[PDB]
Amino acid sequence: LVHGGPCDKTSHPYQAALYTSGHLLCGGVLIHPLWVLTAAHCKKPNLQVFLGKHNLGQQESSQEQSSVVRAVIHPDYDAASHDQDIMLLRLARPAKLSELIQPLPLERDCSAQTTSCHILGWGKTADGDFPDTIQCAYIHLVSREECEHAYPGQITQNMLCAGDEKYGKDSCQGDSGGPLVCGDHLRGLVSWGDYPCGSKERPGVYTNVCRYTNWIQKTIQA
Ligand SMILES: N=C(N)c1ccc(NCc2ncc(-c3ccccc3)[nH]2)cc1OCc1cccnc1
């Protein structure tokens, strides 16, 4: 996450850190004590989910760890175009909820109003390093027509765009699968965007969570 700052340690209880090979790979969102929602491009072997993390460089009293039982990628995910970039992870152990570990409710309304949003993650910052402390930024939803011109032929109905025209606040590598929060609801998941990270010119592209209500329900009930 570029051009942001450290989060208030009590503001992100839904945030998950996804590790493979001992390093941070992706973010994720706790949506149910047994499930974390992330991007399908985060599928890697032996994912380890960390809940209640703020600083990755220190052992915290709030942190919980879980292996993944199964990873459920959306049947229509297209890695070439990033279309339907969503995956459900079933936790081996139900998340022990606290004031620092809580699920985030999903936005089910695709017409939903709220344009003022926020992003968070442990992805690459402006200096190019991977921060130990989670980063936050307030960003705004970018209209469908405007995102379509930034990335011609690349934006589907399963994607939402968001960014910051003023300073370029944007998600980055490592933020993938993290949340786009609008009106205290999960509106999107970090999917892709511009290279290098920064949304001054072209906005960040997010998986449109409202489109997956049925599939998320059906997966959780399976
Ligand atoms: N600028 C952004 N808002 C942004 C946010 C997240 C990501 N995630 C990386 C990522 N998305 C999709 C894939 C992927 C999919 C299929 C197969 C292999 C890989 N990888 C990338 C972003 O911008 C591009 C970018 C690329 C590399 C380094 N920095 C930024």
For residue 52, the tally of other CB atoms under 10 A from its CB is: 24
Mutate to test the pocket of ligand 1, among 197, 199, 200, 207 (most ligand atoms within 8 A of CB): 197
**What ranges in the chain are assigned the alpha helix state H?**
144-150, 213-221
Which among 119, 141, 173 is the best mutation to test ligand 1's pocket, defined by most ligand atoms within 8 Å of the CB? 173
Among 3, 66, 82, 85, the active-site one is 85
What letter does residue 179 receive in the DSSP assignment? Answer: E
Return the domain boundaries, the chain.
Answer: 1-12+104-210, 13-103+211-222
| 82 tagged catalytic | no
* Resolution of the structure in the document, Å: 1.6
DSSP tag of 92: S
Query: Distance from the CA of 192 to the center of ligand 1, in angstroms?
Result: 4
DSSP annotation of 60: -
Give the residues surrounding ligand 1 with Cβ less than 6 Å away. 41, 79, 82, 170-173, 175-176, 190, 192-195, 197, 204
Clarify whether 23 is annotated catalytic: no
Residue found under tokens 């309304």 = 109
What's the 137 CA to ligand 1 centre distance in angstroms? 18
Q: Give the homologous superfamily in CATH for domain 13-103+211-222.
A: Trypsin-like serine proteases (2.40.10.10)
